């Protein structure tokens, strides 16, 4: 078991600094460089730098942002990232490298979120059609889950009963808070004759909201 174990996810405030670790086990630590990489959501991998005792190299782009250190005694390296902004929201990976080899083993990634938001439960708004949508074989309903922090939120419909026809969209940031929507398409037969409710759970605030979708 060669393993690179990174520290856990970090939620830090803008301007703060964070120190992410990458602990190496199962191989001779001083035979490999540790490289750090950023991946912003939905984007590619960017090389930050490597750290090896006596050899630390940065990508120019990260030179003022990241400080890499290695603690050979404990076979751990650290990437310190300073004056954080939401531009630094990313998954950071470490990986190892040696001469004649490649990035063969990687850490699991450490997700960094930089936000000044407080834990905030979602407002959940039912999305019922404006009633010209009262004619087709299928009706689409939704729930707008607005203004929560942090991720995640879980959305189910009729407590998981309605699994088919469900689209839960990835959350987006809107004034430092997340907004997500979910849609469900059900037979016109079944709504409004049957209750449809979106069940929204936000574990960080221990809040659940079960919003019934009722005609407008």
């Amino acid at each position: 078991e060669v393993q690179l174990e990174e520290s856990g996810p970090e939620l830090v405030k803008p301007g703060a600094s964070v120190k992410i670790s990458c602990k190496a086990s199962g191989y001779t630590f001083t035979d490999y460089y540790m490289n750090w990489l950023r991946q912003k959501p939905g984007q590619g991998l960017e090389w930050i730098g490597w750290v090896y005792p006596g050899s630390i190299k940065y990508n120019e782009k990260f030179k003022d942002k990241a400080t890499l250190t290695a603690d050979t005694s404990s076979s751990i390296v650290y990437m310190h990232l300073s004056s954080l902004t939401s531009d630094d929201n990313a998954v950071y990976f470490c990986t190892r490298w040696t001469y004649g080899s490649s990035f063969d083993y990687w850490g699991e990634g450490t997700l960094l979120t930089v936000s000044s938001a407080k834990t905030t439960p979602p407002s959940v708004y039912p999305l019922a059609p404006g009633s010209a949508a009262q004619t087709n074989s299928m009706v689409t309903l939704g729930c707008l889950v607005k203004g929560y922090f942090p991720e995640p939120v879980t959305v189910t419909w009729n407590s998981g009963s309605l699994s088919s026809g469900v689209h839960t969209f990835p959350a987006v940031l809107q004034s430092d808070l997340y907004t997500l929507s979910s849609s469900v398409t059900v037979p016109s037969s079944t709504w409004p004759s049957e209750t449809v409710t979106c069940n929204v759970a936000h574990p960080a605030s221990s809040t659940k909201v079960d919003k019934k979708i009722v005609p407008r």
């Binding site: 990634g109 999305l127 939704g142």
Partner: protein, 219 residues
Amino acid sequence: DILMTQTPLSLPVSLGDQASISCRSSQSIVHSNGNTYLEWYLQKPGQSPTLLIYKVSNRFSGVPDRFSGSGSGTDFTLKISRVEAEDLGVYYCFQGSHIPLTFGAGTKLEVKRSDAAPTVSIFPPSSEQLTSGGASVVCFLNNFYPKDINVKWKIDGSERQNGVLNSWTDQDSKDSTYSMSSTLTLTKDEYERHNSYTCEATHKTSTSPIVKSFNRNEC
């Protein structure tokens, strides 16, 4: 820096057929020692990248023989002779000949399916939200293929771009479609100053945009 250009950025494939992805470097990635340190990595959602190929054409241990790499100099190809479900992910080419080390932007391998027009639904703001002083108008554009779609909001016939937030699902594992949500958020006061709200979707499946709208003073 050596810019690594991958093409295509999204490659629809059918399971079992071959896929090729191109990676071109802006300069030669032949190292002075004459090796070409061109590597390919595969990343699946939520997972670390995995090394597939190194030095252009060598498979890393455990990489099945359906992956092959070729190329020289600045033009490189990763070929998958028979795409399996487990191969779906994002492929990155990487150069380790020059500093800074650089990756291509990634080619996402996606499942090909027949074109599907989006089902578009528009939703006026809920009364609950209006009571809070906000007005989000939501447009769902569901179950379409291919993923390329353009959504435009019009309010009283004029394009509106500010306050729009879009979100896209990944390809649906069940039907290989994509869906998108587009939300226009206004204040209740701004919302009440306009009559017609239109979500307009341009998608390859029709020659003309798909238009859903509602009039605020209707029901």
